[model samples]
Every structure is written in structure tokens, then in C-alpha cells.
Target: GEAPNQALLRILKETEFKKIKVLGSGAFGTVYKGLWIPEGEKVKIPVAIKELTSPKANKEILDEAYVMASVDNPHVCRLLGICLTSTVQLIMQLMPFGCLLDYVREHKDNIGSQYLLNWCVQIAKGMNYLEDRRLVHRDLAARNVLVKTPQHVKITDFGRAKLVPIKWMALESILHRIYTHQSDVWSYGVTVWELMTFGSKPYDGIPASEISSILEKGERLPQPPICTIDVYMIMVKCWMIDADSRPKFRELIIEFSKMARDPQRYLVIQGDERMHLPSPTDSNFDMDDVVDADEYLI
Candidate 1:
């Protein structure tokens, strides 16, 4: 294997560090809003510093740093650098708007359907880029997505994120510990569920232990009350029992792009009223009701 990127291996001194507020905590470490001033920089640039708090997670942290260094996508958070002398410090771009979970919670009622669709599309594009590289984001959920601006969201928090939360995970991952692009497709569907419901917990009332049995029987979460039937169908496709049968991220991108371009076709609008999505069983449903199947494959 090649050596680690030199940029990621750069050393840091104590004088260049400035602590800001604590962003949040996770399975591996606590992220902090901090500033990193290089030796020659006249001013400091705000950045997120992820300090590894779990000794057993060192390899995961390094692996994430490597992934960040290797991949560059606008919809994915950027890795500024890392410090490993005293402790493992992964410097990353600062997302001022916070995670998607909090963003949706505070803005759900005010956000329009078009805006929500844009977020999902951006996430799909990011996942598409990862899948193109044959990488799997074992954890693709609302909490792991960061809102960079009102209209922009980026995927983050790869290290320390693994197979968990039987709700968001696909049947294969939960049962066989298999993490593949298809499995990620399933998780993306659950993520769409999260964005639609404004961060509501998946499988809310069902016990965790019962999830596998229920999923084994082909039970999936119902469409959010506000989700349009078209959007819900995409979720259903993602939850297909056969992983190979799920749509690839590229296919999802094309599907969401169509929705973004023609929201009125997918949703019903009235004068200043919230979009009243017609039921899937509506008699007026047309062939355009579903995504372009010819452009995608099973």
C-alpha cells in the first residue's frame, strides 16, 4: 500500500490551536468548532477538529482521514488536515448550519417540498460519488449529514460510524454484517424517511429486537404523513428484499433530479396551501407517476 498522504501527516504545534464550542459527541469522539492557524497565516480559519476519545477507534479515525484525503466532492465534507503527535486530531471543514437532523427539526414546517427534495438529491449525488469509487458509507443517516448552507448539505462522520440502529440499516447489514453499495441504497431510503418526517425516529414504536423479524417478513416504514406518494414509492423500491434489485445511487440521482425539475408533476399544489400529495391509488395516476424506469435498471 502507498504511504499516507503527506498533507494528512503534517505536524501541528500547541500555539496554533484555539478551541471554540463543542459541536457534538458520537461513538468515537467529540467534534469541536475550533480554529487552526498555520505558522505563516496572518488570520485563523474556523475549522472542525475531531479528537478521538476512544482508544480502540484509532484505526477507524485514520481510515476516515485517508478516505477524506482521497475523495473530493462538493457534497462531502472536506478534510483540512490531521495532527497525530500528541493525540489524533482530524481537522475538517466547518459547517455553520449544523447537522441535517437539527436543520430539519427547526425548519421542517417552513421548508418547502422543493427544498427538501434538493437536500435528498445532494445526498444521493454524494453517495453516487462514493459508490463510483467502490466505497460504502456504512452509516448514511440524517445525523451524519451536515448542512453547509440553507441550500447545501454535505455528508460527514464516517469514522466510528458502523452497522447499528436496526432501523436505518438494511436487512443484509443487520443479518450478515454486509456493507455494500446496495445496502447503502437501503439506508438512503431510510434517510429520505428521516428528512420527510423532520428527524422522527425510524420504526418509532417497534422494539429494536423486533425489527429484523418484521423486515424479514417484508414490513417497511410507512410513508411520512407529508411525503408524496411518488417519493414514498422510491423509498419502497430502496427497501426491496433483494439488494441487487435496489436502484443504484446514479439511478436515484436521475430520479430525484426529475423531481426537482418538475415538482408540480410529483406533488399537488393549492393556493398557498401545503402540497397535498395524491394517494398512489388515485385514479388520475399516469405512467409518469414513477421515475423513468428505462433510464434505470434492477
Candidate 2:
């Protein structure tokens, strides 16, 4: 097996993170909420520390570390450092809230469409950065979105892409094992569905075994009661089985940005399962705008 570029990650003193309580320890490994008190620094910084006891699994986390180090986007989580002791470990920014899935599910009533729309925009921005760098977030989903605060979320859980939860996967990826920006777009569309439904599982009630066939038949997740037909159309654009026809992350950014800046113009936020989105040449759709909007920096 090949190792990831060592310089890509900053190796920290093994003693840096004082192990605190375990945040989660399940199928893979243990994650702990730790405090990093660097030498001469009185103010303690919070970090989530991951421990890999299984020697065989180091490759995946190393791969995940490379992806984090390769990008510097506000919407992507930072890989603070690495520890090369008996136990391979990774230190990351401490997110007060858990994954977007659980956070939104717990606060569904408190969350509104606009907030969900903002998350959709930010997540798209993160994915767009990856797209621009020719990187693929093969596992884009609500569960991978971590919240630093309710107002802020960042993409995490990079190495787990291979697990490729079938529920969030694209048709081509499921059938052909081909993953690319377009497939990420497909998952991003589903992530938006997760947000719209306040963390409702995609294709709810359908058996996992039938997901591919259902998608093959052109069936898809329906509009959430709180999502506008406009937002639903974006998912439809993403769910296009024809991967080439799906919108790019940048294009999706444009769609969500318009809604974020002026929700009244695009979002009515009262869609239903029976509603069908009407398609017409959108007056606002134009690739020329990417250069001028320059909203990625904004």
C-alpha cells in the first residue's frame, strides 16, 4: 500500500492533545473531545481527536488527512495535525454540534427554510472548491457535514467515501463504480434533501436493496413539505441519471446563491409530494455570471 504525502499534514507532539472524554466510539474507532495546550500557550484550544487502534485502517485516515490538507476553504474542516505514536491519531477542530444530520433532526422545529437554504449554499461552496481542485468528495451527505456552531458547518469524514452509503450514492456510482464531480453533485442534491426534510432519510421506507432499481426507474426523493419547488428543481437537476446533464457544483452554487440572497425571488417553501417542477429556460441561468459574481470569495 502507498502512503499519502507526509508533508501534507503537520505532525504534532504525541503529547499535545490531552485525551478527554470519548465523543463517539463505534464501528471504526474512537473520537474524543480533547484540549490542546501547546507549550507556552495558557489558552487551551479545543479539538476532536481520533484514535485508530487497528493498524490496518491507517491508510484510510491518512487519505482523509491528505484531502483536508489539500484545501483551504471556510466550508471544509481543517485537519489540525497528526500523531505518530503507538496509536495513530488525528486532531481536528472541535465542533460543538455533531453531524448536520443529528443536529438538524434535533432542532427541526427551530430550523427554518432560509437556514436550510444557507447550509445548501455553503455545502455547495465547499464541494465546488473540491471540484475546482479536481477532487471528489465521494461521500457527500448530511452525516458528513459537521457543525462548528448552528450558523456554521464544514465538510468532514473524507476517508469514509469508499463506504459510499448506497442511499446517498449516484446511479452511475452504484452501477458502474465510477465516481466524479457529477456524482458528488448527485450526493449534494441528496444532502439538500436531508436539510430540506430536517434530516429525513432519503427514499424513506424503501429497502436499501431496492435503491438502485428505484433510481433506475427514475423515481426519486419527493419535495419536502418545507422546500419550494424551486429548490426541489435543483435536486432534480442533480438527480439526472445522465451524469453529464447534472449541474456542476459551481452551477448549483449559483442556483442556491440566488435563493440565499433573495429568497423571496425564488423560494416559496411550501412544496408537496404531488407537485411537479415545471422546466423552462431560466432567465437567471448563465455560465457567464461565474466570473462576475465572485461570490466564492464573499
lDDT of 1 at 206: 88
The residue-by-residue lDDT of candidate 1 on 1-298, one tens digit each, is 6454444344466567677799988764788987766666444566778877466567778878877766668888756777765567887777777898888788655666677788888999999888766668888999889876667788886763332668888998889988888999999999988988888899888888899999999789887866678989999999999999999899998998899887666544333136333233567532222221111211
Off by over 4 Å in 2: 1-8, 160-163, 264-298
What does candidate 2 score on TM?
0.84
Candidate 2 least-lDDT 10 residues:
289-298
CA lDDT, candidate 2, residue 143: 86
Could you give the C-alpha RMSD of every candidate to the true structure, in order shown? 11.1, 10.3
Count of clashes, each model: 0, 0
Give a tens-digit lDDT track for model 2, residues 1-298. 5445444567879676687798888765789987776656444667788865575688777877777766678898767778888776888887768789998888765665566777888898998887766678788899889987676788987775431489989989899989988999999989988888878888778888899999988899998766667878888999997899999888877888778777645444444223332122434322232221012221
At residue 292, give the lDDT of candidate 2.
13
Candidate 1 Cα lDDT to native: 0.76
lDDT of 2: 0.76
